[PDB]
Structure 1
Amino acid sequence: RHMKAYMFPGQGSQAKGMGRALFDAFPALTARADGVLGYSIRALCQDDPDQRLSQTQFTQPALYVVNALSYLKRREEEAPPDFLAGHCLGEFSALFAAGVFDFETGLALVKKRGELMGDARGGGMAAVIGLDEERVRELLDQNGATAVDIANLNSPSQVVISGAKDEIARLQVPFEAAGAKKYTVLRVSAAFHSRFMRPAMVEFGRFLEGYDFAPPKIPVISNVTARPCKADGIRAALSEQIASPVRWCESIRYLMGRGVEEFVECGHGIVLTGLYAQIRRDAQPLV
């Protein structure tokens, strides 16, 4: 028994085949998911018909389901974590785990979230390796890209930028020329976690008015503030998260400052495990 945090992945971590043993182990919750969604979560995750997993309207419920079942499996065999943190979409899984809403309610929110984000066009995003936050901001401004945002601050050397599709394409060469060790235009049609998501944020906040949320029973480290979610204004903060940078790196350093000894990724893949290792390594001098 150690102080621990669970970390839940978001968009970009999904894969064809995710969740297989989990669906078999949780037939009853799989059925309830299928009832909220109106289609088979298992078929979506295991057969990826029409590569729907890459389409945000479907990606989001897919991640929610596999994350939530990964959580409940884990909870069969161990005590609950001391802290919770969800990366991007995964913030919904942390809130579920914290009892802010129940399984199916959260699934309903994510379904709506995915439909709203699915209507966004004209946007793009790129992952950049090798440049810190400050250097990224200065290169954006120096290239005239004032309407491009830093969407994810993932680790000391990994950020994700987010803005108009043509602008993200055209920034590649200049970032490469200025030292970006890698620059990859992502297969998204929206500028997620940028100010351009304001329309989605406002509509989402309106949609959330019809829901009631409980204060978290276990602290959830917000993507927006890098600090525990407050016991209220949770609806406001979840809507804001859509259009705000994801302060992941700082969230993780916070949890380490708070005494966390063990960091466990719940959900498909090793995206957050790898980021955690980068963050921890950067704080630890080599021998």
Structure 2
Amino acid sequence: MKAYMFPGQGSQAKGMGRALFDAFPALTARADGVLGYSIRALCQDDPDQRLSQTQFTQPALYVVNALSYLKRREEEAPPDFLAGHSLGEFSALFAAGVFDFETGLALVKKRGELMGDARGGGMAAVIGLDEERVRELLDQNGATAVDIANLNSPSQVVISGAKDEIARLQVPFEAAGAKKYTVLRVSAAFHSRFMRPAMVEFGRFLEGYDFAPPKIPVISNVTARPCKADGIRAALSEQIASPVRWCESIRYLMGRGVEEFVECGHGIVLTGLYAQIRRDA
């Protein structure tokens, strides 16, 4: 069986989507209508240097991912499962028929606004340490204001929390065997307790939307299991303050018999994570 994987923040690049805007001109124009600016220009030229800023990145990735999905639907057999990484969940839910293109874009416009306006904390991407070792290091070094934000592969974990703690933890993490420890340029400590205020505000917005049952199963970042219709609204706000269980989601799919994992959107970030999960699993 086959799964499509939808990428999120950090996977964007100038030039993303270039062929797709002309292939789907009505949807591109409708996105411009929702956003108030040219999505083609943002992705192709980034003329205001804001493609890196999540209030803009989130819509850019959602549009590129959605159009990439529509192109794949035109060209190949349908996927058996869908999974998206954080912002990518919205793409996955669109592909599953949970909401339509414009509705998903409204939700991500808001999500990006709220996350870009959040402040408090920071994040670091760590390569080389497993989850239990990361947990041990947080405990042993007294970093009580740091949470695990992403579980991406057996050796790839993102931590999130107090900026001072994120900075000082580089030393004990490198001493333990972190091959790379990268402090991210982000508005706040995403996927941590620092996002509780934004989570509440996003939940209030999501109350105004309905979520149809998925027509193709979507694996949740929160539970690492297929989404249930009645739980989607709540999960989408919880997600921003909760760990992204990506590694587990992919292992669950492998256990279901998925052998083909295809990234739907720009770049090969999720494909790289898959290779590391496969090698361990």
Give secondary structure in 2 for the equivalent of 1:233. Answer: helix
Of 149, 152, 169 in structure 2, the residue corresponding to residue 151 of structure 1 is: 149
Deviation (angstroms), 1:8:
0.1
2:244 to 230, 243, 246: 246
Q: How far off is 1:24 after superposition?
A: 1.5
Q: How many angstroms does 1:120 deviate by?
A: 1.0
The equivalent residue for 1:71 is 69
Structure 1 residue 141 displacement after superposition: 1.3
Distance 2:139 2:2 in 1: 39
Give the CA deviation at 1:88.
1.1
Provide the rounded CA distance (Å) in 1 between the counterparts of 2:120 and 2:209. Answer: 31
The residue that corresponds to 1:41 in the other structure is 39
Per-residue CA distance 1:76-121 (angstroms, 9 max, x = gap): 0112111000011101100000011000000000000011011111
Q: Which moved more, 1:204-213 or 1:64-73?
A: 204-213
Relative to the length of structure 2, the TM-score reads: 0.98
**1:130-181 deviation per Cα after TM superposition (whole angstroms, max 9, x unaligned):** 1100000110111111220110000011000011222211111121122211
Q: Deviations over 1:57-92 (max 9, x none)?
A: 001001000000000000001121110000111011
For the residue of structure 1 that corresponds to 2:16, the secondary structure is coil
CA drift at 1:196: 1.0
Is 1:182 the counterpart of 2:187? The answer is no
Q: How far 1:23 moved relative to its partner?
A: 0.8
- CA change 1:205–1:268 in 2 (3 A) is same
- 1:2-50 deviation per Cα after TM superposition (whole angstroms, max 9, x unaligned): x110000000100111110111211111001001111110111111123
- Report SS of the residue matched to 2:189: coil
Secondary structure at 1:151 match in 2:
strand
Write the distance in 2 (CA, Å) between the matches of 1:45 and 1:65: 10
More deviation in 98-107 or 167-176? Answer: 167-176
Contact 2:115 2:187 in 1 (8 A): no
Task: State the SS of the aligned residue for 1:212.
Answer: coil
Mapped partners of 1:50, 1:163: distance in 2: 29
Q: Structure 1 residue runs of 4+, over 4 Å off?
A: none
How many residues are treated as equivalent by the alignment?
281
Work out the CA distance in 2 between the residues paired with 1:77 and 1:45. Answer: 24
C-alpha displacement at 1:189, in angstroms? 2.1
- For 1:142 and 1:67, locate their aligned partners in 2 and report how far apart those are by CA, in whole Å: 40
Q: Distance in 1 between matches of 2:144 and 2:219?
A: 29
Q: CA RMSD of the aligned region, Å?
A: 0.9
Q: Percent identity?
A: 100
Distance in 2 (CA, whole Å) between partners of 1:228 and 1:126 is 28
**What residue number does 1:262 align with?**
260
Give the CA deviation at 1:237: 0.7
Contact 2:191 2:243 in 1 (8 A): yes
